[PDB]
Each structure stands twice: as structure tokens, then as C-alpha cells.
Ligand binder design. Sequence first.
Ligand SMILES: O=C(OCCN1CCOC1=O)c1ncnc2[nH]ccc12
Length: 167
Amino acid sequence: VNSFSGYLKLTDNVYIKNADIVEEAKKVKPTVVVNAANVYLKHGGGVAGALNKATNNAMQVESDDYIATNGPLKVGGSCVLSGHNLAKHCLHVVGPNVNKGEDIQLLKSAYENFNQHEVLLAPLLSAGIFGADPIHSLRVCVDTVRTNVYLAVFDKNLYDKLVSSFL
Ligand SMILES: O=C(OCCN1CCOC1=O)c1ncnc2[nH]ccc12
């Protein structure tokens, strides 16, 4: 038993709620919050900008040191950094951004990173400003992640659409 509240169960291991991941993180303080990162860990907008803002830019400062030491991530890849005031850890995961022209097949590889963590609070990868179909992102999540994932979907109308179309 964990501390997540009001999630709709979708599968054995996937749960979903209409909420801002930032607000869910501040309330729950999960072991792992997933960031919808880019390969440069430049946290400007959407999930990344919102989480980073909630850390008072400490996420960005830590990220810049990570990139200076290690270079960029791969599309489909991830790294574990601090969760700052929001979580114990932040798993920065790079889903493909089709608005930038990347391969959607890499979305499954991106979700595979979640399997290295027993429980995660996460957003819908490659959706929103990343340009991919959200119904598809949810399907890939359910068909790829085997650990316990609590999905926060910020957009009320998107949430309604995802629940009503879920197979
Ligand atoms: O951007 C997010 O996810 C992608 C799908 N979208 C687009 C806008 O609304 C959505 O749900 C998202 N999710 C959960 N918490 C969030 N806090 C800020 C952004 C955000």
C-alpha cells in the first residue's frame, strides 16, 4: 500500500489521474518522479519546465553539471538525478519528439527505463508538446511498463479522452 490517491486503475500495474505531476509530486513525495526530458536536459516547458520551476531552478543547475560531465542523453534513454523538493529521485526520460522529427518507435525504449524502478509517478511520454498521439503513448506505456506506474495527466479534456478510449 502506497500514498497515491484517486487514481483510476487501468491494468494490474498502471493507474491514471487528472492532475498536474508537479502537484502530485509535492503532495506524495514519491521515490521516483519521471521528467519528460530532452537529450540536453534543458527544462524549458511542459513537464520539464514545470518540475524545474517547482525546484526553483535547482533541477536545471544539477542537470547542467550532469551534461558537462557526461554529454547528452540518447533519445529513448534516461538518467537518475535528484528529486529535489519533489521526490527522492527524478528519472529524466527522453521520449521521441516528432515536432523535432524523431522516430516514434523509440517511445517503447523510453518507457523501458521505467522498469528499473518499482514505483513511479510519471507523465505521458511523447504527448503534449512532444507531438505524438497520446492514445498511442498510453498504449505503449501499458504494453511496456511492468512496474507500478501512476500517470498524471494535466489536461482535463485529454484525461477524459484517454479513459473513454482505453482498451
Ligand atoms: O504536459 C503534460 O503531459 C503531456 C500531455 N499534456 C499536455 C498538456 O496537458 C497534458 O496532460 C503534463 N502532464 C502532467 N503534468 C503536467 N504539468 C505540466 C505539464 C504536465
